Design a protein around this ligand. Structure first.
Ligand SMILES: *[C@@H]1O[C@H](CO)[C@@H](O[C@@H]2O[C@H](CO)[C@@H](O[C@@H]3O[C@H](CO)[C@@H](O)[C@H](O[C@H]4O[C@H](CO)[C@@H](O)[C@H](O)[C@@H]4O)[C@@H]3O)[C@H](O)[C@H]2NC(C)=O)[C@H](O)[C@H]1NC(C)=O
Ligand SMILES: *[C@@H]1O[C@H](CO)[C@@H](O[C@@H]2O[C@H](CO)[C@@H](O)[C@H](O)[C@H]2NC(C)=O)[C@H](O)[C@H]1NC(C)=O
Ligand SMILES: *[C@@H]1O[C@H](CO)[C@@H](O)[C@H](O)[C@H]1NC(C)=O
Ligand SMILES: *[C@@H]1O[C@H](CO)[C@@H](O)[C@H](O)[C@H]1NC(C)=O
Ligand SMILES: [Cl-]
Length: 871
């Protein structure tokens, strides 16, 4: 009896027993599964029922959870090499965090050498939010929210399959609303449940309208259980190539090509809390330098320093705020790291001095792969000589011959960033180069790792690693496609196991380079490839996008997913990397892009210039771009405080509407607009030819940003008028945000007067806060060298409370302007008290009753002190 008892079984709960090929009766019979072909090709024709799996043999309680020996039910194999006996272990890590793993007690299988996640042995946790039930015949696990008895994660729906190069487990989930998994192009933030496959294996590929695995390896996803906001997260700690399959019910199935099963289930009262718990586990995001938040200009192939200078000149002339000039691989001599082109980039050091004189920053690209060739003068490439002497390279399977691939400079060897000696070499290369070219930050690219020859110069050995028995739906269906051989050797292990950790290890390595090059500074690291917890070391951008309306639209989902992944400094190539942009598209994308946490206009090789001033000093594009970038720069104290909260508490920066308005099921699918923290709603034009956007307005009071006027919209879908020069910007009632008088660089804006915008809620209250430090020193938060404020308004009294003050230079700044929105009662008098001394009349205010706005001007409320302001 291989089949269910009823002839018309529930099809949505069929678990595919022939996941990898078109279903045939013979293969189904040979695998011992149930054959029932269907109306279509979405529903499985061959499925498992209870034919495969494991039984519990012995189970005992430990001080921190459970341990069960599992024995395999003696059925036919799927892909060979079954592990007959397996050890199931659980850990009640915190009240919100549950962990289980399934290992081989007789063979120490590959485990991810994560540099943050720690060994756990205690302390024993008395009151957990989760209950865990383990069924014995067959083996299954149920994770239950104790408060309402709701099962969150239920594996009894399918078998445990555990074999050397194929691991499989499924879980039924309690709601139809799931978010996360990457890096792929999802198009929609909320997951399509209709039989979708998501492959995960770091890969250099242009994002497009398909399910390809792209640059990062992110298994995390979360699920909102109900309108209460209760939510949970599922994280698999495994870096092997895999597929995540989603079907209606919903059921999620993992199909993984190696390693162990090591799952974390994370409970939260809200979706934001789930994300916070996730970051608590894998590592809180790095605090960026304040300048990282400035607008960046960039393109592949400016071709000469003369062109770079002209681009800089024209955008300065237009008054485009921008902190940073980025230079791509053309700055190098013949695309070799740690060189610059003495011909086309003659005078580069003096150009960097000019940037620095204008208070601007210079960022360079670095690729991991090192040329095996000579320099242009015929001399040895010292970077390679020194790498050879230090034995820093990834080796062939022989464990002694460096593997040769190909990238930009030609044939290349690959640093093993997991090797301590390689980290030192790299730090030393960055330091040597910084004496020649005084760059301020680093963009680390092609670190999947990418290769333009398949596997290596010698091809690949035909073995089980380069050609596994199960191949997930990865692009090309070939493990070593666009990368190095699976049997290549690193300090952390075989490429088969550690491939997806290359970008992760390189960011760690480059973080240590930064500490050598810029002692005790944050600098900037932008990475292409990421793994779980990469946000602790770097920023990310969505990679090599295209100049189309669709790609602009999809960038919001892309951004939001990385927020979930705890990589808050994220954005897309504004105006589009591949292809020529149009004036309309670039103007719209500049508006939206001013509100990416990471804001950079970047262009591919050979297409027309798309920096803002190129469209004309008097263009509508320059005017619109200058205006929204000035708004961005004005809001940087607010944005920066969000990054402080991400770094310390795991809160998101660019935030899904769902995170604030989960009580409203309309927010569950909302992905064409987003929030900065809880307080600012950004609604872009995303369709060619449009001056009107169908927008969902959540259940809050909203004030138009530019005019302060209350919108007559609440908890409704509106047709928002947004003509050519307008993007939708609304402030939410109940929040107080800090601002600073803007300038064209953050270097200048940081010296300017501060202000506060109070957007009053329904009961005329509001709250918020403000973090301020030197903007650059690593560990200011750890060492307590910062200023911290809370703000609170009720009944026409603003309280400004300094809860921490240990940054003397911050003290030279002052709040000089207070704006109150939605103020319904007239103002007779404004009074100010400092440090609980008596109130003095303040004469400079304007009460606009038509607009309900109170402007209080010419204040001098110095940072470091407490104030009260009454109207
Ligand atoms: C902002 O200012 C407004 C004034 O415009 C101010 O409103 C007042 O608040 C108090 C509450 O602190 C109200 O007093 C309550 O009145 C209701 C009847 O209307 C009673 O039910 C309440 O008694 C209960 O609660 C007490 C505890 O507060 C218990 O001791 C008692 O046994 C009862 O359980 C209570 O007396 C007052 O009526 C209003 N006035 C007006 C005009 O509405 C408001 O509190 C201020 N808001 C903030 C944020 O501070
Ligand atoms: C890759 O191959 C090189 C040898 O070509 C290995 O280099 C050794 O590195 C250690 C330092 O850690 C030296 O003490 C040895 O002398 C080196 N061996 C030789 C023969 O030069 C390197 O360890 C290999 N890397 C990996 C991870 O396999
Ligand atoms: C598929 O089959 C079932 C009964 O076997 C039927 O209810 C359903 O309508 C069929 N699907 C279609 C679209 O014909
Ligand atoms: C007060 O407002 C007036 C009106 O603009 C202005 O001229 C004056 O300089 C302001 N500032 C101070 C500090 O009083
Ligand atoms: Cl810095």
């Amino acid at each position: 009896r291989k089949c269910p008892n009823v002839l018309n079984d529930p099809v949505n709960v069929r678990i595919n027993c022939i996941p990898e090929q078109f279903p045939t009766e013979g293969i189904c019979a040979q695998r011992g599964c149930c054959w029932r072909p269907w109306n279509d090709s979405l529903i499985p024709w061959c499925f498992f029922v209870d034919n495969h799996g494991y039984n519990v043999q012995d189970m005992t309680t430990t001080s921190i959870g459970v341990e069960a020996k599992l024995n395999r039910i003696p059925s036919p194999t799927l892909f060979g090499n079954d592990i007959n006996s397996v050890l199931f272990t659980t850990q009640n890590q915190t009240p919100n965090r549950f962990r289980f793993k399934i290992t081989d007690p007789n063979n120490r299988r590959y485990e991810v050498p994560h540099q943050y996640v720690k060994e756990f042995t205690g302390p024993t946790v008395s009151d957990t939010l989760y209950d865990v039930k383990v069924a014995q015949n067959p083996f299954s696990i149920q994770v239950i929210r104790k408060s309402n008895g709701k099962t969150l994660f239920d594996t009894s729906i399918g078998p445990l399959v555990y074999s050397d190069q194929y691991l499989q487990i499924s879980a039924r989930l309690p709601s139809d609303y799931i978010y996360g998994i990457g890096e792929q192009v999802h198009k929609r933030f909320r997951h399509d449940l209709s039989w979708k496959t998501w492959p995960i294996f770091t890969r250099d590929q242009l994002p497009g309208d398909n399910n390809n695995n792209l640059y990062g390896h992110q298994t995390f996803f979360m699920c909102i259980e109900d309108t209460s906001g209760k939510s949970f997260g599922v994280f698999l700690m495994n870096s092997n190539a895999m597929e995540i399959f989603i079907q209606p019910t919903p059921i999620v199935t993992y199909r993984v090509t190696g390693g162990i099963l090591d799952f974390y289930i994370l409970l939260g009262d809200t979706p934001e809390q789930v994300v916070q718990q996730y970051q608590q586990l894998v590592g809180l995001p790095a605090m960026p330098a304040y300048w990282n938040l400035g607008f960046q200009l960039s393109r592949w192939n400016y071709k000469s320093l003369d062109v770079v200078k002209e681009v800089v000149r024209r955008n300065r002339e237009a008054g485009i705020p921008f902190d940073t000039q980025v230079t791509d691989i053309d700055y190098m001599e013949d695309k070799k790291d740690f060189t610059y082109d003495q011909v086309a980039f003659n005078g580069l050091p003096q150009f960097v001095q000019d940037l620095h004189d204008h208070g601007q920053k210079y960022v360079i690209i670095l690729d991991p792969a090192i040329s095996i060739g000579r320099r242009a003068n015929g001399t040895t490439y010292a970077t390679y000589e020194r790498g050879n002497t230090q034995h820093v390279w990834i080796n062939e399977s022989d464990g002694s011959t460096p593997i040769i691939g190909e990238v930009w400079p030609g044939l290349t060897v690959y640093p093993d960033f997991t090797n301590p000696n390689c980290i030192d070499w790299w730090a030393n290369e960055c330091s040597i180069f910084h004496q020649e070219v005084q760059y301020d930050g680093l963009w680390i690219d092609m670190n999947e790792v990418s290769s333009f020859i398949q596997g290596s110069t010698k091809g690949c050995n035909v073995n089980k690693l380069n050609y596994p028995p199960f191949t997930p739906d990865i692009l090309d269906k070939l493990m070593y496609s666009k990368t190095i051989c699976m049997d290549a050797v690193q300090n952390w292990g075989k490429q088969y196991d550690v491939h997806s950790l290359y970008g992760y290890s390189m960011a760690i390595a480059t973080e240590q380079a930064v500490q050598k090059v810029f002692p005790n500074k944050r600098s900037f690291i932008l990475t292409r490839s990421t793994f779980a917890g990469s946000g602790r070391h770097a920023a990310h951008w969505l990679g090599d996008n295209t100049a189309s309306w669709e790609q602009m639209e999809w960038s919001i989902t892309g951004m939001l997913e990385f927020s979930l992944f705890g990589i808050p400094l994220v954005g897309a190539d504004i105006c589009g990397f591949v292809a020529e942009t149009t004036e309309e598209l670039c103007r719209r994308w500049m508006q939206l892009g001013a509100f990416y946490p990471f804001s950079r206009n970047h262009n591919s090789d050979g297409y027309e210039h798309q920096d803002p001033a190129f469209f004309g000093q008097n263009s509508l594009l320059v005017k619109s771009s200058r205006q929204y970038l000035t708004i961005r720069y004005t809001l940087l104290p607010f944005l920066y405080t969000l990054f402080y909260k991400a770094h310390v508490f795991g809160e998101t920066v660019a935030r899904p509407v769902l995170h604030e308005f989960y009580e409203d099921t309309n927010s569950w699918i909302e992905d064409t607009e987003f929030l900065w923290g809880p307080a600012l709603l950004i609604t872009p034009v995303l369709k060619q030819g449009a001056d009107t956007v169908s927008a969902y307005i959540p259940d809050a009071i909203w004030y138009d940003y530019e005019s302060g006027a209350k919108r007559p919209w609440r908890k409704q879908r509106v047709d928002m008028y947004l003509p050519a020069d307008k993007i939708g910007l609304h402030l939410r009632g109940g929040y107080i945000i800090p601002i600073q008088e803007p300038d064209v660089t953050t270097t200048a804006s940081r010296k300017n007067p501060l202000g506060l915008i109070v957007a009053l809620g329904e009961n005329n209250t509001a709250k918020g806060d403000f973090f301020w430090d030197d903007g650059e020193t690593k560990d200011t938060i750890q060492n307590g060298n910062y200023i911290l404020y809370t703000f609170s308004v009720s009944n026409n009294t603003l309280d400004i409370v300094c809860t921490h003050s240990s940054y003397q230079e911050g003290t030279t700044l002052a709040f000089q302007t207070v704006k109150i929105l939605g103020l319904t009662d007239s103002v007779t008098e404004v009074r100010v008290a400092e440090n609980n001394q008596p109130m003095n009349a303040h004469s400079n205010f304007t009460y606009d009753a038509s607009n309900q706005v109170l402007l209080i001007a010419d204040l001098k409320l110095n940072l470091g002190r407490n104030f009260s302001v009454q109207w």
